[PDB]
């Protein structure tokens, strides 16, 4: 007798999927939704190549530390990498006010180049000061490239003042500092005035500073201590300096332009010659899968982060042996 029958597929697939009602259900076809791997390498994005730092920290590159003379010509980047180790930043002992903000602002911008703000040739005080705390690469007593240490000239320190106006059609970031001598002699030897008034003023900010003579614990073989500061001069605005001692005056400022990825990654990954869509602190990635399990913190077009190692979606039907 002639017969006809309806039936379904089965194969030697060992792939299982979970449902809400049952665990590990055999199926014919499956799709993995989670990319599990990474390539542990630093690649460039569509904005360009990153700025890798293994010798100098970012706050040292801004202040112009004398061991960071490589970066005086200026750099542009897609993102910034810092090696997680002992990096050369602030040479002379002291704290930077709003340090986390300064690093955030400077990483946000694409390009920076140096610009001379103040000419110390006309100034009637000595500006050639150096320190053993701020050694150059040859271990010679030097100082910051972007700021000058103002001391007395011919046994006097008169009230100095000078102006600089921004007409570059772009913002400028500049830094200064207040030196606090340890002893009374240092104050009279360096600046000659027991009490001094220093101030930095623009069209928006109005800031004044006083020293206070008193020794500190040794940090880098120095009984003294500094208080570092920074500001932003907008296009058309005017900055004006005024002191009679106790200022590390700005000589150079940083002309900043464009937008970066606004990121400082912290890894020991090797810099490779490659272009990428997605970049992580853990590595690089290119996949069609909707999910990934390496990190939630990424830059560029990347899959969604979930902590699961594997998620299987059923495409085919239940795998039923005959």
């Amino acid at each position: 007798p002639d017969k006809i029958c309806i039936g379904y597929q089965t194969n030697n697939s060992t792939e299982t999927v979970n449902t809400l009602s049952e665990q590990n259900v055999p199926v014919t076809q499956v799709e993995e939704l989670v990319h599990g791997g990474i390539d542990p390498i630093l690649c460039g994005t569509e904005l360009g190549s990153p700025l890798v730092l293994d010798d100098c920290s970012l706050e040292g590159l801004i202040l112009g530390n004398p061991k960071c003379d490589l970066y005086l010509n200026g750099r542009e980047w897609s993102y910034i990498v810092e090696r997680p180790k002992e990096m050369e930043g602030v040479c002379y002992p002291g704290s930077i006010e709003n340090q986390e903000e300064l690093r955030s602002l400077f990483s946000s911008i694409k390009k920076y180049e140096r610009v001379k703000m103040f000419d110390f040739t006309k100034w009637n005080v000595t500006y050639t000061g150096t320190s053993k705390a701020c050694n150059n690469t040859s271990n010679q007593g030097s100082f910051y490239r972007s700021m000058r240490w103002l001391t007395l000239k011919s046994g006097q320190f008169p009230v100095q003042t000078d102006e600089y106006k921004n007409t570059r059609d772009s913002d400028i970031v500049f830094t200064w500092a207040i030196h606090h001598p340890p002893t009374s002699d240092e104050q009279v030897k360096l600046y000659k005035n027991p009490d001094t008034l220093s101030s930095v003023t623009t069209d928006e900010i109005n800031r004044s500073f006083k020293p206070n003579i008193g020794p500190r614990p040794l940090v880098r073989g120095q009984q003294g201590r500094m208080d570092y500061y920074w500001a932003v001069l907008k296009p058309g605005q005017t900055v004006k300096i005024q002191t009679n001692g106790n200022l590390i005056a700005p000589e150079y400022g940083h002309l900043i332009t464009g937008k970066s990825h606004g990121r400082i990654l912290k890894n020991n990954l090797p810099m490779g010659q490659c272009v990428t869509e997605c970049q992580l602190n853990e590595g690089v990635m290119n996949t069609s899968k909707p999910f990934q399990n390496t990190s939630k913190h990424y830059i560029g077009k990347c899959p969604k982060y979930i902590p699961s190692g594997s998620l299987k979606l059923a495409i085919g039907l239940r795998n039923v042996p005959q």
């Binding site: 007798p1 809400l20 990825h261 990121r263 560029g300 077009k301 039907l317």
Partner: protein, 155 residues
């Protein structure tokens, strides 16, 4: 399954059927897949897969922020946001896959049941349902049943 066709009244599948999911196996004087139901099923499982990928496709760049020793609270507030959004997505991603897997298995179960019904409906009084997905009754007549052109009035 809900529709009780796959691993139900049709106990086992056919390893000989490689061309598609659902198919016909006859026995006359003298195995193949139905291209209507199987193609319509593949369309649904390509559009479903794409929609799952599309719903998760939107990206936001979660920056790492630096905080001082006196900024303990705003550091804790920032870590809460990142830890609590990831939990909601981890839930959604995991839950959506468990819900759609159950529906997919039951959708395949219904496709077989419908293909068994539409063959029973075209044959009418001529055949008898064995109750294991079979129908006791030319290669043309078997071919006219496959593409759904069989005229029961002829026999």
């Amino acid at each position: 399954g809900l529709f009780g066709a796959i691993a139900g009244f049709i106990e086992g599948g056919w390893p000989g059927l490689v061309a598609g999911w659902y198919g016909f196996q006859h026995q006359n004087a003298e195995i193949a897949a139905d291209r209507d139901s199987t193609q319509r099923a593949i369309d649904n499982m390509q559009n479903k897969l794409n929609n799952v990928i599309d719903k998760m496709n939107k990206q936001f760049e979660v920056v790492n922020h630096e905080f001082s020793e006196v900024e303990s609270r705003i550091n804790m507030i920032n870590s809460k946001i990142d830890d609590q959004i990831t939990d909601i997505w981890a839930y959604n991603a995991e839950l959506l896959v468990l819900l759609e897997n159950q529906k997919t298995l039951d959708e395949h179960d219904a496709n077989v049941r419908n293909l068994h019904d539409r063959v029973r409906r075209v044959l009418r009084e001529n055949a008898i349902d064995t109750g294991d997905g079979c129908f006791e009754i030319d290669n043309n007549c078997m071919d006219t049943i496959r593409n759904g052109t069989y005229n029961h009035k002829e026999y």
